[PDB]
Amino acid sequence: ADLVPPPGYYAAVGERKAGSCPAVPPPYTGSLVFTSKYEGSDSARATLNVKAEKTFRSQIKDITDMERGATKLVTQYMRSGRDGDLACALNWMSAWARAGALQSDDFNHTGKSMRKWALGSLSGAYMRLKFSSSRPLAAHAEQSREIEDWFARLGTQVVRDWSGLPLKKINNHSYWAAWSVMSTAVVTNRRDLFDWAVSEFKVAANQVDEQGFLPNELKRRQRALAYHNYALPPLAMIAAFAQVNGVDLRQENHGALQRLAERVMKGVDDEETFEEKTGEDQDMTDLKVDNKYAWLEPYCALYRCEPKMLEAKKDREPFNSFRLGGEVTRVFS
Ligand SMILES: O=C(O)[C@H]1O[C@@H](O)[C@@H](O)[C@@H](O)[C@@H]1O
């Protein structure tokens, strides 16, 4: 059977009551060898290097602008239905597609991370255009084909980028990569990509220990809780997408996805168990950011959320997360 997204992705284009179309960021065709924002850290890779981060953000500026700008345009279109926003979004994505952006075989860890992040953002947003009951892509077949072929090329490459690794090298980056590949799989109806994403979820589920911790995220010391929370959105999205395609992953490794989510939310309330496990007081900075809990939307579509969990979701809605394609609450409501 053809691959499908969760039913919320079939929502009609809205008509809520007008921005213009900015120039497309220059397609990034360069090598993907970038500076790490943690350059100079020890094995925990948790010491921010402000100078390196500045260099990193500068190196990836056109990619960042593309990610944020294109998802914003799709969000605007799905909200208000102005054809100009659709036209602009498709112009941006098809320009990058035709150029073959982000396809470099020259990359380091940071660079391949950028490839999968951008793929997830753009395909995640495009998903709404593709499956909307309004069929907005009907009048844009040539551009649609160009964009989808590009996603397929990138998706195949992302599988290459994160395959062949042992568990100690499989962390939140692989989970995010698997989301990008799942998203691409459904846009492109590619079962092989779907299957890879499912396999990666299963690896993650089996990495969740008996208490709900992930060893490789615990290694990030004072950022441990933050990185556990960072693992949740791609894993929950993969499971929600897999479920409607006939693959139920909710019980993998004794309901590992639930065990991880509950451990995280326990730690958000009381930092104790994470400090005890890491031996360092946790940086709570990221845990204060509402949109970093966007995983609650697919999570509560999968599981019967207890009142604490439901309350956590309601108090932070609506969720916007460009790495998940934009309006997460809308596509699960
Ligand atoms: O420092 C690393 O290992 C990675 O850390 C992650 O948080 C990301 O910042 C990624 O871009 C880096 O390459």
Q: Which string of b and e fits 24-58 if b means at least 16 CB within 10 Å?
A: bbebbebebebbbbbbeeeebbbeebeebeebbee
Closest among 153, 160, 70, 66 to 112, alpha carbons compared: 160
Rounded Cα–Cα distance for residues 35 and 111 (Å) = 8
Q: How far is ligand 1, taken at its centre, from the CA of residue 219, in Å?
A: 13
Is 38 near ligand 1, meaning CB less than 6 Å away? yes
Query: Is residue 326 within a helix (H) or strand (E), and if so which, with residue range?
Result: strand 326-327
Do the strands 320-321 and 326-327 form a parallel or antiparallel pair, or are they unpaired?
antiparallel
Is 110 near ligand 1, meaning CB less than 6 Å away? yes
Alpha helices in the chain (DSSP H): 50-59, 61-80, 83-99, 109-131, 141-162, 172-188, 191-207, 215-218, 224-244, 252-269, 272-278, 296-302, 307-314, 328-331
Tell which one of 37, 57, 115 to mutate to probe ligand 1, the residue whose CB is within 8 A of the most ligand atoms. Answer: 37
Give counts: helices (H), strands (E), the chain: 14, 2
What SS3 state is found at 255? helix
Q: Which atom of ligand 1 is closest in space to residue 113's alpha carbon?
A: 11
Q: How far is ligand 1, taken at its centre, from the CA of residue 166, in Å?
A: 18
**Is 227 annotated for ligand binding?**
yes
What SS3 state is found at 194? helix
What SS3 state is found at 40? coil
Q: Which amino acid is at 264?
A: V
Domains of the chain, by residue range, sit at: 1-333
Is 37 near ligand 1, meaning CB less than 6 Å away? yes
Q: How far is ligand 1, taken at its centre, from the CA of residue 16, in Å?
A: 39
Rounded Cα–Cα distance for residues 262 and 267 (Å) = 9
Q: Which atom of ligand 1 is closest in space to residue 39's alpha carbon?
A: 1
Is 94 near ligand 1, meaning CB less than 6 Å away? no
Q: Which two tokens stand for residue 128?
A: 């709404």
User: What are the residues whose beta carbons fall under 8 Å from the beta carbon of 245, sequence distance 6 or more?
Assistant: 1, 3, 4, 186, 194
Cα dihedral 13, 190, 204, 282 sign: negative
CATH architecture, domain defined by 1-333: Alpha/alpha barrel (1.50)
Q: Which two tokens stand for residue 152?
A: 């397929």
Is 172 near ligand 1, meaning CB less than 6 Å away? no
Rounded Cα–Cα distance for residues 231 and 324 (Å) = 13
Rounded Cα–Cα distance for residues 291 and 52 (Å) = 25
Look at ligand 1, atom 9, and give the residue with the nearest C-alpha.
37
Is 59 near ligand 1, meaning CB less than 6 Å away? no
Q: How far is ligand 1, taken at its centre, from the CA of residue 115, in Å?
A: 13
Q: Which two tokens stand for residue 45?
A: 């890779």
DSSP label at residue 320: E
DSSP label at residue 328: H
